[PDB]
Every structure is written in C-alpha cells, then in structure tokens.
Amino acid sequence: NQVLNDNIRNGHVINQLMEALMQLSRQQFPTMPVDYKRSIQRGILLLSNRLGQLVDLTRLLAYNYETLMACVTMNMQHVQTLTTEKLQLTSVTSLCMLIGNATVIPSPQTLFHYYNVNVNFHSNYNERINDAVAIITAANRLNLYQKKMKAIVEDFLKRLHIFDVARVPDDQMYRLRDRLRLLPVEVRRLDIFNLILMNMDQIERASDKIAQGVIIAYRDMQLERDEMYGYVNIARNLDGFQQIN
Amino acid sequence: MDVLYSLSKTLKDARDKIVEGTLYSNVSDLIQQFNQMIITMNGNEFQTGGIGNLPIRNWNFDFGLLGTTLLNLDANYVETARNTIDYFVDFVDNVCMDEMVRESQRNGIAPQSDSLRKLSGLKFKRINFDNSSEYIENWNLQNRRQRTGFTFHKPNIFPYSASFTLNRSQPAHDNLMGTMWLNAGSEIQVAGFDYSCAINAPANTQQFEHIVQLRRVLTTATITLLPDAERFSFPRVINSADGATTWYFNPVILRPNNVEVEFLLNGQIINTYQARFGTIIARNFDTIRLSFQLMRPPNMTPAVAALFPNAQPFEHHATVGLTLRIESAVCESVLADASETMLANVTSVRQEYAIPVGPVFPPGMNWTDLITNYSPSREDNLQRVFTVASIRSMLVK
Amino acid sequence: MDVLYSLSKTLKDARDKIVEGTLYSNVSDLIQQFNQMIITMNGNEFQTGGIGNLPIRNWNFDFGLLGTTLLNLDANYVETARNTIDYFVDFVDNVCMDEMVRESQRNGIAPQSDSLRKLSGLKFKRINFDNSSEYIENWNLQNRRQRTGFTFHKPNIFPYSASFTLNRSQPAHDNLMGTMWLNAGSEIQVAGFDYSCAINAPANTQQFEHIVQLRRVLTTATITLLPDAERFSFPRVINSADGATTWYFNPVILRPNNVEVEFLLNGQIINTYQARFGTIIARNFDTIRLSFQLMRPPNMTPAVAALFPNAQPFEHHATVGLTLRIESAVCESVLADASETMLANVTSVRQEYAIPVGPVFPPGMNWTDLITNYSPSREDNLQRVFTVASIRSMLVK
Amino acid sequence: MDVLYSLSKTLKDARDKIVEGTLYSNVSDLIQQFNQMIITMNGNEFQTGGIGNLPIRNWNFDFGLLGTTLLNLDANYVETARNTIDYFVDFVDNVCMDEMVRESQRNGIAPQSDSLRKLSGLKFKRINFDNSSEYIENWNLQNRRQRTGFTFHKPNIFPYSASFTLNRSQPAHDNLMGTMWLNAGSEIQVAGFDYSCAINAPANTQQFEHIVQLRRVLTTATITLLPDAERFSFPRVINSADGATTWYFNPVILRPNNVEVEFLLNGQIINTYQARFGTIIARNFDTIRLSFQLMRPPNMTPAVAALFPNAQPFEHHATVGLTLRIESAVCESVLADASETMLANVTSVRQEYAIPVGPVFPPGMNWTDLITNYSPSREDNLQRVFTVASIRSMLVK
Amino acid sequence: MDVLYSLSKTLKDARDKIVEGTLYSNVSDLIQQFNQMIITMNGNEFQTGGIGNLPIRNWNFDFGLLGTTLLNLDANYVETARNTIDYFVDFVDNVCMDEMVRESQRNGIAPQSDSLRKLSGLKFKRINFDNSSEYIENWNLQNRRQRTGFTFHKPNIFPYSASFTLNRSQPAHDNLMGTMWLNAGSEIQVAGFDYSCAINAPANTQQFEHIVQLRRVLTTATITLLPDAERFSFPRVINSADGATTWYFNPVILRPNNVEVEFLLNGQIINTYQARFGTIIARNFDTIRLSFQLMRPPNMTPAVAALFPNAQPFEHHATVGLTLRIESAVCESVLADASETMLANVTSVRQEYAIPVGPVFPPGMNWTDLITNYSPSREDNLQRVFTVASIRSMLVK
C-alpha cells in the first residue's frame, strides 16, 4: 500500500505547532511605520492563545487522514496533476482560530462504504484489463489485422465509467495499447483461447454449409464413393498441386 | 552478485528456447522476465577493464522490447532478437573477466570492480531468478549460513609432496629403514622399506606409518585402497637427506602386514579399516593415517632365503606399501578436482590478459601453493572467482 | 515413494526460483503446485526415528499460504517463506534418513518406515511433478517395467580380487608358470609368467588366459586396453598357495603375443579385439576373457640370451601382461562408480547413526561383499536406498 | 532464536522499570511491547526436559493484560504483575537450559529442542526488540556475514601445556641445553637453559626460540612482555623425556639477550618487537614467536666466574627467559576469558543436572580439550550455548 | 565532535532496535531522531584519507526517509533500511580512522581532518543525543570543565623500569647492599639485599626504601600488598652499574621488617599502612613510598647460622621484599589499563595503515615512552584519539 505517510511528529506529537508558535512569540520589533507592528503582532497573538487549540487541529487531521487512508486499495504515487484546486486562505484562517473542543470522526458505516467503492472500481479496472488483454492477444494470432487499435480501447474506458473518452489525445489511446499488449492473461481467460484454437480446424470443416477449396485436374477423374453421401467427389487430401491462399 | 547470475540463465534459457518456429506458449513466462531487464538497464552507462592487458569497452543501452503478438515464432522475430543478445553476450564476458582478477585482503570476499560494485545496487535487484545452477545454489546458502556443499570426482586435496624419511640410516646408506611417499591430488602412495628385512626387529616385524593432514574436511568420500605402492617398487638412485650424496634403493615387495587405515576428524577415529582393500567409505575426516608392517617371512624357499642374509651386505630391500585414491567426495570449501574447469578458467583468463600477481593468490594460481596455505581470504576469493567462472561457462566455453 | 521425489524438486526449484526481485510470472506455474501441497498436509502428525542413535522428532502441520497478489517479489515476501521452507528441509532430512536404513527380505523393493508407509497413501498422490532427475526417471520405468538404465564413470563392477594360479610349480618354487591378477572396481591387470621362458614349450610359446565374470551386464562400455601389467612387473616375495612358505618372483617383461580380448554375453562372443591397444568399445557383455601368450624371443642379443639359459636356475622370469579399464558404461542395475555419491551417502548415514547390521546388506555396506553376492533382494534394496540418497542430495549435501 | 532474546530484555527492562511510583508515560512505549507478547502466546503449549536429571515440565498460556489507564502506579498494580512475570521467569530458565545441552554434528549451529524449534516459527517473530546486549548484537551480524567481534580481559587462548625440549642431553643429564615452558590461558612463560653457559658455543651465545600457535586469531591485543620466567627460576627435579629417570635443574638467571617477539599471521610478521619490555600492541596474529639468547658474560667477577668452569661438572645452570601476558584482545570466535561467566554457566548447568556427555563437547566442557580441537562444530555449538547463557544472566544470576 | 558520537548510538541503538517484527511504538522516539539526520546530511560532500597507505574515498547523499504510522515492521522494511545503514557504517569507519592519526601541537586537542573540521560546523549540531557511553560522558564534562574521571582494571601507570641501586659495593661485588626493582603497569616489586646480613649494622637492621612517582594522580585505588618479591628471590648474574662486568646475586629471603607504605599527594601522607598485607585502599596519591628493613635474626638454628658468618665470603645474600599491585583505580586522565582496547585500537589503526610518526606521539604509540613524558599535548591528543576509538567500537570491533 504505497500510501505516502508523514511525521509521527506531525501525527499527534504535534509540537511542530508548539515550535511554530514559540518562534512566533519572539517576533515583535521595529523598521517602518507604527500602524504596522501593532496590527501585525496583534494578529500573531491570536494564533498563540489559540495555539492551545491549534494543537487539537493537528491531532484531528493526523488521525482522520491516517484513518481514512487505510481503506484504499488503489495504490497512490505522488504526481504533479495538471489541474489545481483553489484554496482561499480565507477559510484556512477561519478553521484556525475558529475551532474549539470539537471532536468528530468517520462514522463506521461511512468507512466501509469507502472501502467498498474503491474495491469495486479496482475489481472493474483489473477485470476489464484482463477482458481487454485477452481480446487483443487473440486478435493477433487470428491475423485479424484490422481493429486492434481503438475498437477495444473505446469499450474498455467506457465500462470504466469515470472518463468520457473523446477528449483523449490520440497519442494516448494508442500508447495505451502499446502498454496493454505486454502482459500475461488471467489464466482463466487465456486457458480458454488455447482450447478454442486446438479445435478450431475441426469445427470449420465439420460444418454443413462450406468446405475448404477445390482442385482442378482437366483429367477425366474417377469419382469416389462414401456411405454418407453416396457417389460423390470429395478428397480429404490436397497434396501434389500448388496451394493459393 | 546474485544479480549477475540471472543475467545468464536469462540468456541461456533464452538463446536456447528461442528458434524459428516454437509456440509463444513455451516462453510467455520467459519473455516477460526478459523485458523487465531491458528496462532497468538502458539509461545507465558502464565501464569495464583497465587492469593489465584488458581493453576498456564502454557500454550504453536503449533497446526496444519484444512482441507478445505472434503465437508462432517467425524467423524474422529471431534475428531481430539474436542481434540484441549478442551485445549482452560480448558484454557479460567483458564483465565476468573484469571482476575475475581483482583481489582484496581486508574484505576480499565481496564485489570489487566499478562494474559490479554498481550491480549490487538496489535498483537492479528486480531481476534475480532460476537459481538451480549448483554453484549459485551454494553461494546463497552461504550468505545466510548453512551446510553448503559441492560434489567432486578425483578431488584435489593433497598438495604435491614427494619425499622420504630415513628412520635408520648411516653414511654408506647400505642398511636403511624408513618410508617414501607421493601425496598429490586425490592420491597417496606410501612405501615402508627395511634393508635388513626385520632380521633384528622384535617379532621380526617393522612398523610403518604415514599420516596426511587435509587442509579441509572431506565428507562422503568413496575411496579405493590397494596394497602395494607401484611408484616405489622399482630401483632408484636417490639424493641423501642433506643433498651431499646419493643412495641406492633396490626394492623387493612383500604384502603389507596388519594394514590399518584410520580416517580421523579432530583427532577422533571416524572410520577405521583393517586390511580391507577395494572400495571403502570415509564419511567425515580431516586426516588419514595409514599404518602397515613388514613382517620377515617365517618360511622361505631357497630363492627367497637368498635375498635376506643374516649379515650385510643387504642387496635386496624388503618393501611394503599402500595406495589410496579418493574417487569422489564432498567438501564445504571449493577445491579443484579432475572434472570441473573452474580453476583452469580463472587461471586461463588471468594468464591470457597478463594479469599482475596480486596480494591474495600465489603466482600463477599455483594449486599446490594455494591448497598448502589455504587461508580464509584465499578461500573467499577462490569461491567468488569460481562462482563467476561457473556463471561465465553457461554462455562462453 | 514417487511422492517423496516431488517434495524436493518442489523445494529446490523453490529455494532457487524464489528470491528478492523476479517477476511473479516465473513462478505462477510454480507457486500453485506448491500451495496444493501445504493443503494435503496440514493436520497430519508424523513420526521419525526409533532406532539406534536416531532422534525421534515429531512434526505438526499448521501453515498459511502464499498470496498471489504481487508482481515483483519484495524481500518481505521471501523471509516469510524461507521460514516455512526451513521446516520442510529439516523435515525431509529426518524423513530420508529414517527409510534409509530399514531393510526387508520379502518385500525389500518396497517402503518400510511409519513415515513413508503413510506417504504411499492415496490421499497424498495429489503432488507428484517434474520427474527429470535421472534416478526417479529410472525408478518409474522400473515399475511399469522396461529398458531401464544409468550412467557411470569408472563403474565399480569387479569385487576386489588379488590372487594367482600356479599352473606348473614345485616345492622350491624355482620354475613356476601361471598367472597373477588384480580385479578391482573398473580395472583388471593380469600377468602370465613362465620361469622357463617357454624353453620346452611347443613353438616356444606359453598360452595364458584370464576370465572375469561380471555380476551384472554392462552395455555401451568405453574401455582402455594396454599391454603390460605394471602391478606385476616388479620383484615380489609371495606366499605359497598353501600358506606354508614364500616364493620369489623376479619378472622381466616381454610384449604380450597374440592378444585377444573377448567380451561375451551368455557364452557368445559379442565383441572381439585382436591385439588392439588403446580405446575399444564393448557394447553388451557379462564376461571378459583375455588371452595372451609369452613367446620365447627367437633372436636374442647376448644380454638377453644371458637371462634365459637352457637349464635352471631360472633367475629372470619372463612375464607378459595386460591392463584393461572400463572408463564408462551403462548398467540396468544400480552400481557404485567413481563419481556418484550414493553408496557413500547411504553408508555414511548408517555409520553416523550407528544403525545395526540388518538382514539384507553386508556389514558396513561393504562393496566387495555386496557385488560378490548381488542378490535380487540386495539390488532392490540398493536401488530404493540409492534413489532416496539422490532425492536427499537435491537439498542436503 | 532472536525471539528468545526479546523475551528477556522484555522482562529485565520490565522487572526493573516497573515499581510502586513512577508515571505511566515512562513505560507507555514499554507496556505496549509487553502485551503484544502475551497475545501471541496464549493458546500455545510447550514442553521441556527429557534428558538426564532434567525435569519434564509442561506449560500452558492464557493470561490477562494491563491497564493503560492509571496515571501513577499503585502497589496493587505491581503485585498483580510480578505474579505473572514469575511464570515467565521460571519458564525461560527451563527453556534456556533445555537448548543449552543438545548438540549436533551436521547443523550443530541451528536450534534443536522441541521448545525452540517452535519459537523460530513465523507467527512469533512479532516480538524482537532492543538488541543492544553485546552478544545478540553479534549474533545477528553473523547471520548476515559481517566483521563481528568481542571483548575479553586475560582471554583463554592457550590450552594448558607445560613441558620441555632437550636440544642437547645425555643419560646423566649433567650437561643439558633446551627450553621449558608453560602456556596456559592468556600467559606464556618460557626459559632457555644451557648447563655449559655457552662455553663452546659460537660467539659464546646459545639461541633459543619458543613458538605458540593460536587456534583462533586475536586482534587488538594489549600485551605485557617481561624478561625472565620466574616459574623456571628455581631448582627442580624433573622426569626425563622417556619417564625412565629424573634430572636436576639448578638455574642461575641472566638477562635474555637479543629478545625478539614476532606476532605472525599466516606466516607473515604483522608485529615485531626487539627487546621491548612493558606494554606492546599486537594488532592481528595467529602465532607468537619468542626468540632470545643466552650470552656467556664476557667479563665476570670471581663469584660469577666460579659458577661457570671450563670443564664439567656444570653445577649452576645458566638460564634466560621471557614472560608474555595477553591482558585484553578481540576475537571473532567466542572464547573463555577471566571475566565472563559464560563457560562457567554452561558447564555449571550441565553438571548440576547430570547431563550425559554428548557428541560435540569434551567431557565436562573441559576448556583445554575444547580449545585444543576447536572444530567448527564445537565453535557453533559454543556460540549458541554462550549466547543463551548470556540471555539467561540478564534475569537469573 | 559530540556530533560524531551520536552518529553511532544512532546506528547501534538502530541496527539493534530495528528487527523483523518488533512492535512500532518502542521505536517512534527513535525513528524520528534518525530521519532528522538524513536531512541535515544529503547535499553536503565529504573527503576521506590522504596520508600513507590510507585510501582516499569520496561520499555523497540522498536517501529516502522512513515510514511512520505502521505497527509491526515487515521484513521488507528492514532490508530497505539495512542497505542505507551499510553506507553509514562503511562511512564512519573511514571517518574515525582519518582523524585517528592526525596530530597537532599548538592545538592538537581539537579537530583536524577535512572530514571533522566540517562536522563541528553549526548546521550539524542538530543531532547530539543519548550520551551514556562512559567516554563521551567524560569528554563533555572536560569541555565544560570539572571532576571528570574513568574506571580501570590493573591500570597502566608505571612506565617499565627494571634496575638496581648499589648502596655499598666494591669491585669484586662480593659484599653488596642495595635494592633492585621492577615497576611496570600497575605493579611494583622491590627487594632490598644486604650480603652481610646486617652483621655490622646499627641494631643489626638495614633500612631500605623504594619511591615511585606517578605521572598522574590515582584516586580510589584498591591495592594488593604482599611481603616478598618473587621476581628477586632467585640466583642471578647481573651486569655491573658501569656495564664493565657481572656480579652474582644468591638470595635467601627473610620477612620484611617494619614495613610502611605511604601514599602521598604533593608531599603529604594521605594514606599510611604499617605492615598490613592483603587489600588496602589508597584514596588519592601521586607517589608511593615503600620502606622496609632487613633485620638480622637474633636467634638462629645451626642451618641458619651457617648462612651468615661473621666474616666474608658472604655466600647467601639476605633479601627482603614487597609486591604491590593496583587492581583498580580512577584517574582524571585517560590511561591504558588491562581491560580497555583504546590504546590497542589507536595503535592498531595507525600500524595497519602505515601512518608516519607524527610530532606528538612516540614511535609506535609506545606506552612506556608516552607515560614517561605524558605532556599536556600528548594527553589531549590521547583523549581525543581514545574517545574516537570508543565511538568506533560501538559499531566496529
């Protein structure tokens, strides 16, 4: 579970807070107009007094994150998203000096629900993956040189819900294949294809309507006889004459 | 190190299971493993060689992967692969060789080369696999700690030693008594001679003894013990102990009497055999003691009586002997033997590249010198160096 | 039995292919097989020992499984596994050893121990896999029954035998004619001597012959045949046939004349070689017959003429000889040879644990005694016991 | 094994840091660790004993836990705890002792008892902690293969040896020349005597030498070297080499001339000191060589001249000597020394419970016998057994 | 400096308290401390070596941190850590050693190496902790200044001195009176001899005295004082004071009369003992004065009377002596003793790396030379160097 953690220090050992404050407790001095230090330090103190409480904040998050987190299957490497998420220091500031002996946590029922979801999702991702792979590989040893590209990919993403394809850079969808076409295959999936191929031939000729090619001899040739058809012209063996796929 | 191993069984189980035809299904579990490697690699740069007359080739990587497509290999697939393997082959060679020469007193049991010191790195471990090659199997078990073990045919445990000890001698060397022997490899031949044919000896019997101390314990040894020492059954002119003159040995052979072979371990008798010739088992020992006697024949036909007079000159010298050969055995330490090419590989690579004598191994990797003073440092270096030779022989012979 | 086998290639192909790194894929087909085992086991109590100095360790089974929820094996994965293997290792050892001693006349070809009698059980057969270990490969083929077979370097087919036969002798032993030999392991040396140098023999030629009957047929034998028997080329004082006195042998060697080696099978000549020294092939035989002659030199320089007078005393004894060594061969029955440790393993385990002499094997598993009277019971027990030793050596050396 | 360790520092850092008074916060990090244990245990059964006069006690588990409540510790809290510890104390004792007697040849190192074989189990590992006890610190590093290490005062490296060597002697023993010594523990005393006071010796100087080969290398040794061997400075009546008679030694002491001490490692001089008495450092050696001479005084007052006549009888025997003591040193192998109680603990537990002599250790754990033939098996067993003794001494002295 | 310390107890209390399985909580206070370090480091570069056969290795940093809210540590956690510690280990070694050879005079009491001069830097002080290692405990207190001190067994306060002083002598050396002694380490043996047995001495008593001035004050000394000097109780041939001839000493021992031992401090008697043999305490002294007398026996049996005639020749030389050993003591200055390996560590590292003689320490760190002229500079350098040796021994022995 790659779930980037953080200082036990931060955790509840909190002090960082106590130090964040002590460092503040000695910033009260000259340089420019008076309407300045006055206003400035006065604000600072409101952090100090509240510090007793600000402590509590650290604890809170510490736990919560440290809790919720647990129930996450979806690994999580740290990446530089392409989108932000605006955060007005406005609210920040409020939360800060504005919290008292409050104490809340995740309702049991709440937690599960969380697990459950990531779960499903995961399962879907993983599963479709297999569903995906299986197909593509088959797609190659079948010489179905055609769809292989998009076709499969499209369905794939759709079933994953989450994103609306379309706005997927073309470099992405294909690159997606490039990665997929390099994995094993749920024994289940795989184990079956191996089966179909082995019998494949047998089915095809074993059908009523349709047979494999014909031969030309321009040589008054002798018709054969077979119980099931009577007097007919078959020949289960083409050998001795070129073959033209 | 373990890293190194993989790099090979990778290629062998590769250059072997990949040919025009075969179904993909015989390599799915294989292909994968392979690729994984390529990735970890390319991007990192290497340097090999320098010391002695050994070229310094620099190596870069950035090779595309494979296909999981075709479920029936087409010739074209092979060639585009063999061309990528032949860079790893010609590589590894230059890699083995580089760490197959550097020695270190202090901690000369671990990696040395700028090539390998970088391999033991962590970001590489992502490869290790199929450790069924007798040698690696043993390298690991040694890292953790456990009853290791190897298998040898005609092992090379005895440093060459060919000498004699005169228990009774005089300036003229006309009435000697003593033993002469040859300890070499897996064989011992020892003869006890008494020019007087025990004429004045108590019970007309002269006792002999030959003790050989192994530098390493051998276990599960299958041994051939035969009476007589053919090597010391013919006339010889030998240098005296002080090198000042030469004496004459004119043997006549009698059966060794009261033969007793003891295989001891730390002074304790583990196996003892009384006059048993043929095949015997010595299960655990660090010392062999051969005791045998010359007993003057109590009854002699005229022709025999004539060889053994009551007074000097003693012209026919009564001799009894034994021959002992260790056909196979197990040793917890690496050793040279009559089948493995390890010693020869290491010695050969060093000789070919004019590698200077180092601080650990005797000049020329001389076996006798090595086994005579088989220090812990020499053994650790020898094992490292033998294990590398074995990794190399999986691809290059 | 076959059961037993798996238990190992299981662990080897395990303790070998499972290490910090590799991609799951390499072991998917492996992991599975493994688990399957654990299941079948857990819950069954096992007892080992109860004889001589053999501890009686009891074993319980309650072990977890192996998640398949990973790609690259993290160190943590290994250790939690090695700890579970080290119970099977230290187990199997105590298992092999237990059935590597008991013997049974009636059904010696079968299992004995309270440990194994329970293994042949049906509910366990759910394991068996990868039977490519030369020995098991042969165990199986022997129960359905067919052309079984093994490989041996310098095999051990000849029970030790060192003796002579005087075809012409007299009390003084001053004019003897006969042969002396040493048959041991894979080698035969035989010399024919005629004190009179065929002075009164028809065509001045004395015929000699040495026949050796193998206890088992050897096929595909590569053999070295050389003229002369070095072992019988030196002066000796030997005990008379009745042990009442000693005779003198003072050989002078001549080339063996009209050498003919026959490798016979059931009385039929399968291979015959006339005076061919060097490497020869004997493809299927149960008997070797060496015929050779001493022919008095028709022309002699003075020095030679002086050795062979028309009348006694005969002081230089004309001797001709042959040396034959079986380098390699195939046998349908297990045998000791110069490379395999089987005999030594079995003999060593029995010696270490002070196992009492049983009803089948000679005291000390003595090879000469065993091969001399190689009964069907001894062979079936030997094969069972050798196969177990080979299973054990896959893990413990 | 490592398991075992914890079980103790658990109790010590327990029976010690827990008393009527202190605040919870001083043990919060401790209490926790503790409980964790209890859990893992309860439900599991153990048995110990069954060898000699050693009882066979059976133990079961299902104990409560501990209040994470209270701010301060009230007496009542202690007692309800001590009562639960005293079962673990009286337990561990019976545990250590059980695995402190069983010895083995093959894997003489690993566990042995039905008590411990179950501890190395995986489900227990959840206990290990605070491994600063010098011995465990070293046990681990050894399982990983690293430059280990111990500390000893007056170490016990020399097996007891008290003897002499007469380089010149005659039946009357009235004009002897040779050396006599005592090697024992960490000390060596050696004297060289020459009854003739080098009257006919080249340069009127008699050379002496004493070589002592350690069974294990000692590093970082602080050594006291002093001239004279007080032990051999007084009149003695000694048995002759053959035990047939007694000789008289009447020493008069002279200063040892050209004293040279060499501390060698594998034949190489690592440290050499010429006539330096007092404190010297020998940093790494497996052999000590002491060379010293007796030089006839070139100038003698009448009283001195009278002791050394030109002709026999020689009534005052010129003697020179040296004394060497290893005060402290480091050894990579466990050894007995003058401060640690390990050897005494192991020897004492075995003696008290009438433990039968086993296959590894000499009768009575005799130190001289042990160090004389300090095989790998004896060392592995000794280390296991010494480490357990040290774990035990943390709680029971 | 203090910096350095931490770097270790960091690793020990690390490579020890961090094992497979331990509950988290008992390390929380630890993990933290650890990380803090890593940070401060990564970024800054270091230089090691550059003198003699001292390698010159370079170092860099950038290692991931450590987890926090876990529970029980999984094997995988360890290995990814041990690999990061083994760089600090192999580092510190190369660090200690570098500053364990450099010496300065003006200010040879402080840091020297390009490695350490950078450590005392301020941005580093962010680490110091757990200073319970006897040596650092004392380093600090010395920095701030105060009653420092250490603990020693058989301390090494007396430079080797073995000599004599003839208070009455003559050319023939047939009627001498004086003292001879051996001061070495923690022991003093002194004998007073009077060839005339005080025949013409006032009250038939000859007074003797031996004074030994310590180079440093010893406090809280436990001392063994015994009558007799065994070292000077046997016959000797000694060189004359001018080296021109040799005299004969033939002692006969009498009990020392009116024994008085004074332990003085700056000329003042701190402790005085009159004829008290056994264990005595000397609480603070820089000088020991031993006074004792030889009193001619007023009543003598014939055998005794015969040894002491009224006129020369005096053939039996009356001798009285004392032996004093300092078993333990405290000193405010570092000293070598019989248990600590500091001197040996420093001396050994310098010898192994062929470190050239410097301006402060005598060649070879010779103890006698060092303690004889124990200047302030030598003591400050010795303490720095001993403290570093002790820091090193916490990790590397």
Automatic annotation (TrEMBL), chain A:
Post-translational changes noted in the entry: Sumoylated with SUMO1 and SUMO2. Sumoylation of viral proteins seems to have a positive role on viral replication.
Localization, UniProt: Virion
Transmembrane segments: none
Assembly and interaction partners: Homodecamer; each decamer is made up of two conformers of VP2, called VP2A and VP2B. Interacts with a VP1-VP3 complex. Interacts with the intermediate capsid protein VP6. Interacts with NSP5. Interacts (via N-terminus) with NSP2.
Protein function: Inner capsid protein that self-assembles to form an icosahedral capsid with a T=2 symmetry, which consists of 120 copies of VP2, with channels at each of its five-fold vertices. This capsid constitutes the innermost concentric layer of the viral mature particle. It encapsidates the polymerase VP1, the capping enzyme VP3 and the genomic dsRNA, thereby defining the core.
UniProt record similarity statement: Belongs to the rotavirus VP2 family.
Entry comment, domain topic: The N-terminus binds RNA. It is necessary for encapsidation of VP1 and VP3. The N-termini of 10 VP2 molecules form a cylindrical hub underneath each 5-fold axis of the inner capsid.
Protein name according to UniProt: Inner capsid protein VP2
Species for this entry: Bovine rotavirus A
